[model samples]
Target chain A: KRKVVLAEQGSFYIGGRTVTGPGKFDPSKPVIPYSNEGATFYINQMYVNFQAPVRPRGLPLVFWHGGGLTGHIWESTPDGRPGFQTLFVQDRHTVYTIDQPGRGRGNIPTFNGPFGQLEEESIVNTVTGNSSKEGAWVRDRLGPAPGQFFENSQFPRGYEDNYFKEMGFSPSISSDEIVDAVVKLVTHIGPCVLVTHAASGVLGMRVATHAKNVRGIVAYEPATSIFPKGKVPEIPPLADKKSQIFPPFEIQESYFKKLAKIPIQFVFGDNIPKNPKSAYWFLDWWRVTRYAHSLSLEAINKLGGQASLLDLPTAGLRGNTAFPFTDRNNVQVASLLSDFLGKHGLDQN
Target chain B: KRKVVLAEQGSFYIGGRTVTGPGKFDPSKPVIPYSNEGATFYINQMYVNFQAPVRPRGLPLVFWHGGGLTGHIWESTPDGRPGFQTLFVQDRHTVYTIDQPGRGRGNIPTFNGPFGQLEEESIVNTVTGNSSKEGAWVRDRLGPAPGQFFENSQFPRGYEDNYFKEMGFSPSISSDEIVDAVVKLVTHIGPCVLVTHAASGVLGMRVATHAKNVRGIVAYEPATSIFPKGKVPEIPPLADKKSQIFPPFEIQESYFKKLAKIPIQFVFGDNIPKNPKSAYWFLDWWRVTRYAHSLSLEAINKLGGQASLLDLPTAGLRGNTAFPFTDRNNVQVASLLSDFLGKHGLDQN
Candidate 1:
């Protein structure tokens, strides 16, 4: 019975090439003839789905997804619950979700080669989180060992299949293509707030660097952070031999300054390892990445920019997974986001 | 600049399961652990994209795509041309385009097995015709041998790569899942007209039989036809040894009667071989399938249903390939479809 009245809803594509001289196609071949001459290929386009409420109360909200996922991530939760797409619309916000260039509905064969997907182990280790696995990292960062839930994980239990089913393959296209397409979309839609998740967090920041229309950003469990040139913090040391060091992306000072002009909020879910020596790569990665984000936020605040980091557990909200917005208690998470927007005057009608 | 003013726009999903009892995920494995116990999987859900104009002038229009494609088919053509989506919106229609269960944005891993895609040869041989290929069917059904254009084909020249790139892998789900999901969507949207293309035609008819809201249907270059129980026409003989025989889907007579109440139109593009003996399987298949559709239409008309067949060339519109609605002169094709809707009172506000 969940419903949100809408004044308009539709979708569109942005930024593609009318590649020519690829010759004739031969279906008999196992691979696409990228080098064929005289044929035209439209490659690297991004797809966007949008909805405007009957009475919008905020700036347009653009949703950028993580790796191996599409705009579908914003549509509905795996357990049949309404996801951010509806929740935000019900909140009277204009919402636009995108499939990065060369992925999902934005899929168009590219010269960058074949697509790839995250293995089940990766989803379990990082995204969904499982404590029953035979690994210390799983126990330390995800939950107590030999247990199913993260003590009180908010992820809808018994819907792991649905969540896994939603996963899709990633494109072989460059990050530059993704950023460019997002910039084009933000430009076309005018000023907007960006809500980015996981892998897209850095890309969203990169887009904000170039696209002046980006009013603010709300990043959820961002995989990493990016800093200004000559201002990068030292790489965090790994907790275990199996864990890898975490580094921040470095851009020109001018671009970083441009990015700093916008308000940003970095959000994290529960069960994140506070101690670096607790687990493996994923756990260490999360612990270190959040630290790097905090450092970046401090620098931004010093430069007169607005930025804050939210650790759900620290905020008295617990049991959230890597995908806090789609977790069972997502409404609470969105409430926090709405408040952030209000603070920045981004929720104004 | 091309612009579309809309009062509302958005998207949603329909018909999925909250499968449970599959164990924990292991990324180290190359394949998904579909058999794992205690885990949940949400499989076979359909995705839908929609738009409502400022002043809608007709019943909601539902678009169902063909095989090896998704709802993307209705968005924009490969050569950067606006497709039926924008055109119908301009005509003041609420348009709903779908990604069939387990396909494109609707992709949710299914227990039905691995996904597959149409090879480049299939595209060249059927969808985007190529006359320069070394095959008789290419010459007879597509165009004259040793030439690029189909003499007077409407497909945009030199854009083969774009057309091919638009292709996507098909899901392993059953037609039953697709029809049921579509039925749920149509019922949810209320009474609407269905615009189906290629492989979707038969499914659309089947849906009409179950979903009473299907007011009318416009099928473009449908791959085949369906008939009532005990009323299937004789299968047409293949013109060449390499050609496939055209067969019609058979359903109960009661369902057929239900379908007979709604108006339906079957459309075809140019360069279709009228003579069965002229080429290969694709050419023969098209020639025979159109004949089968005509017979079905004749039966429907006799049963008092409003049904008609329109061959683009016969209607004085030429150069249309298998995909008439996405051809270079697609606007003209849409105009014809608009006229059909008007004739049936489907254009009423």
Candidate 2:
């Protein structure tokens, strides 16, 4: 609805460089540099030096944050090892982590904490403020840790449709923009490897639904079925049943249906929010969330009983956050990437 | 070729508790168990009593080992983190983890090592001639930690061909019997997931290349080459680049051709053996190897660039002895069971 690019000004250590950005990719935005050329959305052009064996290069797998988090959660540092930097280091893949208008590096004008409320602000404010380190805290005070623990290696190197605009992360705009970006990116690499976490996964799914160039998807704990149910929330009264939206929307439904045609996978951690509050949520909602994600797979006849739907509760982001990937767990997390590449015949043979 | 099963010596163990073989389901030699009386190979009926949230069920993944090792290497108990046991407790996939015929649990009747020498002899005779625990100490030992190291996850779940006999693992067997056993084990859960590593991966690939049903494959660095490269030496190369088989068999040519047709991918670690001395021969072999593997993706042209051959050396591996899976760096190593499922569209969106 609006166009804005705001950066959360913060400084931190990365690869030893004291770095700070308004968290926006806009030159005037502090952290990032975003420029709107006109089309539908403006994608930030971020680059990383993929040093090593062979300079890694690939179509960027850009994405936007899903829920309350920002793109920085996908990648925070600039010294290498957050967002595009990390993905670049791991596989020599070219990366471009975008700071959506209102989230993380993609925050927009009205997102600078509110210019105070004066400086602090609107759409970009997290439900958890800066209390938790993984929240906005990492953006402001993540220097102590040499590397970022908030970063996840599960998704690919690029984020689609950054919300660093006044639009404030809408499923429609975000999904569509990401779809265009992914299609554009994938055209460069033949097919693309899309990665998403939490709400971002929905955006990624939406993108996949919109574009056919998506080769495979590594959906890390997506909660797409959070949409309210019409009549019943439980089916057969299964305790784990959560209501799902059966859509009639032309674009969204066709987009979601296209998801089934592509090979998609989900990753949930053992620590995936299992408290009483989130229990019914996970069972009814979460499980159903996973189920709806499989709607794409179901259309492809991928679930004949032999297929698997993983719920790695023991993994990172104990609560409902997208599976928090780590070095130790990275082996498994990276597998999501490699397996996608391998299955779809990407680069990791 | 030899028939080790015929010279059975009961079941193997966990502190004396019988774990493998000599079961009622254990079919007689030549007439394999699940093969309707006329069959010629054994079925991996190893069952588990698992109770987890998201892992797979039924005939889940099984295991087989290389020379000087058996399933025991996988299920070893140390400091409480028993491999298979922890897998269940930690909610990871359940692995049969067995020492096929020429190693651990299975009886050894004139068994040969990777190079045709007495495999057990390395540890057994090194001290005095007792193939017991005391002698085991004289052999190599485990490293200090298990931090995401190795790609053991890709170890062949269940597949052994006449090749193993050549490498001196299984007793003498025909490729037909080999194919039969593979089909039996793989089809256990109707259409099951297939994972294989190193030379074993070759066997798994051969089976999958032909089997009609095989939903998923986690081929951790398979030695697949469409142009039948002669069997790789179990031992590392003898000299430098002298015997370097860059274009092994017609691996690059053939595997490339085959990759286009199959829904498979390659998984390798960054620590790809640079020299033949390491284990996988020259790192160049990987090029040819992965190239060949990618062939499965070639034909449609959809996968010419889509198919990938990744090497995750960053995940860290212990040794080049056997294809060290179960590590973080190995392709699909981080999350084998889950990742492979995802690539196959088994994962939730």
Candidate 3:
């Protein structure tokens, strides 16, 4: 039989708000089905895709997309490249990609708002380093060209309309809520290799700490903070001169010790690193957290935990940018992760 | 008439070596045509594709890919996105994408060694912040998934196999030689807008200085340029330049004065500014050049040159990383570039 994929989607009412049934369907004039006073309610959602790889491998793979992105992260690219989800399935392994609560197919509730969304331009900016601002430094850097980028860039050749449309906003998101939702999901998909990117970087770690079955963890340019030894210091002034502190929350030293047993890899692109001249905010964060990772790795290794830090350059992969999975080299990068999984015992039978 | 496309592929003896050709061809006794010792020779290659837009408009357009890349910059992306060349062609302008000498289809001389080619691992590191090396910061920054990235990256999503195959390398080169070749191409093309990336960033300006017909220029993070008037320094050391000296070869006051008439756009992604920790070498270059562009823009504006700096973030395109052409939002960027071209009369009838 040919390969087949099936999806199971469902929602849970994790929180709620109540309204009095008063002013009730007043039998007066017109009858209303429900109260319009906007009663409070909350819901979370999840998506599970079960594909029996023609040839099954070791453990199943669970994927969680970053903030503002849906489970579709595991699907094909805007230009039609097979997504990580598809590739893993093709590689003959059971894969589970989730929308997570509060995003994508992960159910959004009626009362979901006070919404916060990234400006469409920021998405373009993060992906290509090209700022659309009139007097922004990136403007002059790329030349006076109205639309092209300033640097020799490697963003895909064409994905504009799709990118813009893919833009999304989350209801005023909460760290606790996000963590809670994902931890629950991981609990359900136990004993699987957990993969998370960007916003969910921290979520993956928290899940590792909270759940018992995350055999391995793969984080690509995650937004999670370093497991700080002390309070992370604040950085230089922003464009507005206001002081901003590093966002990675500190993790307990005990947790670090626990992570020692789990094999984890933190991946980054060519964009990281601060040489001598100009400084990039993103790279700076990477450096700080990477340092933390090193510390964590040291601790883990000392504790007999298996953890490795795989920078793409070490593998001879250059031009690796912020989103490797979405990059031109996603498959090669994915294969590397697959190898790591194999090494960690998450291999085909 | 139907759209006509023409191609000319040839090599120029930019430089060469001499070897011994002994025992000439003979019908009898084990004739050895040449000696085992290898010798060098001069060589340069260029592949130029000339396509007639269904409806021709403005001046022709020229594109120069970045270091270690080839003329296929305008071809379909690994993920199947229509390249910028296709978009421009549809926009009605004849586009010329060149494999500048020393890279890709532009073959290098035999003596080219000590040559540097980006490793595939490095590409993943730069774009996804993940590396294949042991103990590298990105490995920690991105998490321990050997082959994956951390977030909802805007990369094309799946391009591993394609990226590896698409990888190319060029010989160790000199700025002067690069400028010389592009100058030749510009002189031949005449009156067209020049678009360049990475190593070719500074080459565009030199061409503008030497070629009278260069109508406009688009530089995406050039490696060289004029020093800004005020106190903005701190560029790192490259193999060719002295500390802090901008790469654009300094021109006479007259050249700066002459540039007042040329419209130039220096575009950069949002990746230019430094955050707190990571110190990416490539981003450092971008940050440095963008600062230079800002200063140069000021100087040019002061001198009557039309120049502007563009950072995609201002236009609300965030997550803009390196390689805009291959980014998921490339069409958006292309449109912006196309608009710039149109603004300056590089559009069609």
Candidate 4:
């Protein structure tokens, strides 16, 4: 029997605002007036769920999810497999997973903007990798074209519906708001490791630069990269003529230097075409970001920081999707992370 | 240091549908086509987060939330106290918390209806009990009128903003859909106790009547009651003429009998004005439900079923608002639940 000993476990909200001038309380009506002449409303708060092990290993691990998702991404895979949250907790780490402001459990009517919706095809093509499906675009970037598997793709097949079920509305608030909230969270539960995925990758980097307590970072397939002001690398050649170039976010030079002090690892899944002639728009985006990430890592190393990138294919693990941690061979993926933590003495109690 | 040992922990989705009629995927535009020419969409699923202990105590405990809330209610109080999920897990019981369909992490673009929003004054007057505020109504029903305290309210004062931050959009889906999703969940994880609060109390009872897995129930301040068909009791006298009367839901006799077979407890918090006259609308609603619950319990005991009502005032636990488990004396409140579970042999593995 595996017993998980926890010294503490609970949840709390980090950042939000209390606005006045909405009007009186009326339960009968369906709509509340927008005019803030005299009313109180709370909006844009981040929710954090945490579990502290009885004898923690090292620093606490904070999990930030990707777009169209919430803290649920770390809880369990759609196929009912143990997720990073459980596996890491079992390995003796304090875990804190957050629902970003205006998303999932953190959702509140902010009246800021409309919620972004995710389509099934978008998920199927990018994450789940149903390359065989008609109109699939992922095949172009991770190819043998549409209607063929990636030899030994680790994604569990026939669970596309399950994966779709795990998806939620994208954040309604601003990315800056989310960053501010996470920075506050890192400050509140500081000197901790930050683990992020997909869209949260860039945000995590920004947070690391701003927050003093980020001890380390483990980002999986981060969608974008950030750079120190005036340090952005040259844009790589586009694989597809129609593909648009995405520029890296720039932070203050001092903030970028702060990130160099911590250990950081960027992991990429398998099947990204080594050289693409006519890749899909998303594939080209990934390729450009991947290139930028390498440059960022090189810069950090030059500044005496500890940072590395793990391209799954080169590491002898193949056929993984953007979501390696949720793949069928997730346990193996987790082992790589364990090894990194150990090497950096992050697992020491 | 308290160590929590878990044999298994994960999450899963239950009850959803796939509709094949949306159209192609386009990343640029904000909206997708509605016509069912050729596309797939997944909708109406419930999300469950669970943790199974190493050596479990008794049956698993499932937490269902009230309206205007999510499963976050079970994780921690607004004031950063450990909630029932952590406390019960510490006591060696496996716990499962759910986000009902069309709400929280379970939310998706169903295109069914607009989401319902909550107001700050409503929360202040009802759950948080800020009676001293102008235009406060809870005081009219539970006490010394508006702009005054309830003598000894257990609610932590000056944290109304935090509590408000916890509020979320109400479920956009139908109540029947919620019940159906929950029934599927109960069947999947059977022979488990169901704990509910506020609006979910009525839903919990309905699920108990329909699912065989419910071993026991502990409901706090349920909004309504359900009775056997043609067995709904007479309308209680109105505490205030303006207060609207709500009738109990009617279930089949056989289904009602199923609920009677389980150990059931309905708990009401302190400060419910005894013999209230000219009470506020919500307080009157609570009063009617309370009276109906008593009748339901009497009927169950008559049928040789185990059921009882725990009125906090009579039990010597005073100053509780509608949410006893979230109050300052929550530990004491949790002890009462533990006592009930132990008395019913629900704590024995």
Q: Write candidate 1's Cα lDDT for B127-225 as tens digits.
A: 111111223214223454324566787766766554554554453467788898899898899999999988799999999999999999999888768
Clashes (candidate 4): 11
**Model 3 Cα lDDT, one tens digit per residue, B86-191:** 5776677778777665443343332111111121111111111101111111111121222444353345655533332332223345566667767777676778
In terms of docking quality, how is candidate 3 classified?
incorrect
DockQ, Cα level, model 4: 0.26
User: 2 or 4, which is superior by DockQ?
Assistant: 4
TM-score of B chain for each model?
A: 0.86, 0.49, 0.73, 0.85
After aligning candidate 4 to the native by TM-score, how far in Å is the CA of B59 from where it should be? 2.0
lDDT of each: 0.69, 0.34, 0.52, 0.70
Sort every candidate by TM-score, greatest first. Answer: 4, 1, 3, 2
Q: For model 4 chain B, give the 10-residue run with minimal summed lDDT.
A: B121-130
- TM-score of model number 4: 0.84
Over B267-313, each residue of candidate 4 has an lDDT whose tens digit, in order, gives 99865645654535445556666887889888888778999999987
Say which candidate scores most in TM-score. Answer: 4
lDDT for A285 in candidate 4 is 56
Scored by lDDT, model 3 comes in at 0.52
Q: lDDT, candidate 4, residue B285? A: 55
Off by over 4 Å in 2: A1-66, A74-88, A111-190, A226-253, A271-288, A294-296, A299-308, A313-321, B1-349
